[PDB]
């Protein structure tokens, strides 16, 4: 169990590791939406952890990772500025930005197709009305609280 909870790297948001399983913990934030299986894990910005509550709208909760209604699992998070962020700056974390519609609960998608903001085929090449859907984060240690990356490991019973 511990070998899945905490490791040396984490997956980006649009491709969240649906990792399988088959005297409190020293993590400051802890909240359960059921009683006091599949464990997922990814990295999201500090202020945007709230959207991973059961049933809320936003930018990540409905376009990248969506919990179901009447949720039957807990959520965990803890600040991870030190390990992730660096003075040089890292850019290997992506989140989907332009998507046609919402996401069904516990649905994920991996794809790189240009979003057609208007009415133009674009021949698959980015242009005025065609955009790349995935845009990356930017991390640096000397940022305000909320912009720092947070590691999230949701438990779904």
């Amino acid at each position, epitope marked *: 169990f511990d070998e899945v909870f905490n490791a040396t790297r984490f997956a980006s948001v649009y491709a969240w590791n649906r990792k399988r399983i088959s005297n409190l913990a020293p993590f400051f934030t802890f909240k359960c939406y059921g009683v006091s299986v599949y464990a997922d894990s990814f990295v999201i910005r500090g202020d945007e952890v709230r959207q991973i509550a059961p049933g809320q*709208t*936003g*930018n990540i909760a*409905d*376009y990248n990772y969506k919990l179901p209604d009447d949720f039957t699992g807990c959520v965990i998070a803890w600040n991870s500025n030190k390990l992730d962020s660096k003075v040089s700056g890292n850019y290997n974390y992506l989140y989907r*930005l*332009f*998507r*046609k*519609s*919402n996401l069904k609960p516990f649905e994920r998608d991996i794809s790189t197709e240009i*979003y*057609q*903001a*208007g*009415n133009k085929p674009c021949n698959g090449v980015a242009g*005025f*009305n065609c*955009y790349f859907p995935l*845009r990356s984060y*930017s991390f*640096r240690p*000397t*940022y*305000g609280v909320g*912009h720092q990356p947070y590691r999230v490991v949701v438990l779904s019973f």
Partner: single-chain antibody
Amino acid sequence: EVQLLQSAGGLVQPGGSLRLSCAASGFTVSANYMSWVRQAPGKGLEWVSVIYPGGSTFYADSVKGRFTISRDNSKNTLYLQMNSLRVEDTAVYYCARDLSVAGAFDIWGQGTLVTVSIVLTQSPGTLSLSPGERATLSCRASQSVSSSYLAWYQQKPGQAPRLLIYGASSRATGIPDRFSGSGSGTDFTLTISDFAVYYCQQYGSSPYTFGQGTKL
């Protein structure tokens, strides 16, 4: 051609209410982000609403509730309905799309007024310079957000504002080479080599914010 054409107006009493309509051509309004920017006389711009594709709605705290933003897929327009308009709510309302990373309010409507019965600062102030020399405009933020967020605007007297640079380093399309902006961290500097009021924009937070602006 692509443009936002807006049709509304009037002078309604504190009890009353009216409807604001904005129509778009060249792109389906049910595809990209849409918002509504409000400018009051003598004050900088302010954010009022965002609609995402998929129907999620967001509102400013000052106008939390009491408004409603609805889009009509069939007619390819954008609708805003104001209910229970208070006193001292008069201002010109702008219709503008949103890209938020590749662009910041790329194309704007002509702007129509409705009449009723992270804080940024602008260091340069009302800086006046003779023609033929370079000018430096400095914008200072609070939380020291990432370098790829702030964008700069130009607004001639009584017209829709336009964007110059969206990523603080990449000029917009159809922009002369004489405009350049730089700076990372807590300060952002833009320089020229056309008199207007130049604003600082920043996304990355729920409420957004605009600078007070400077008079050239």
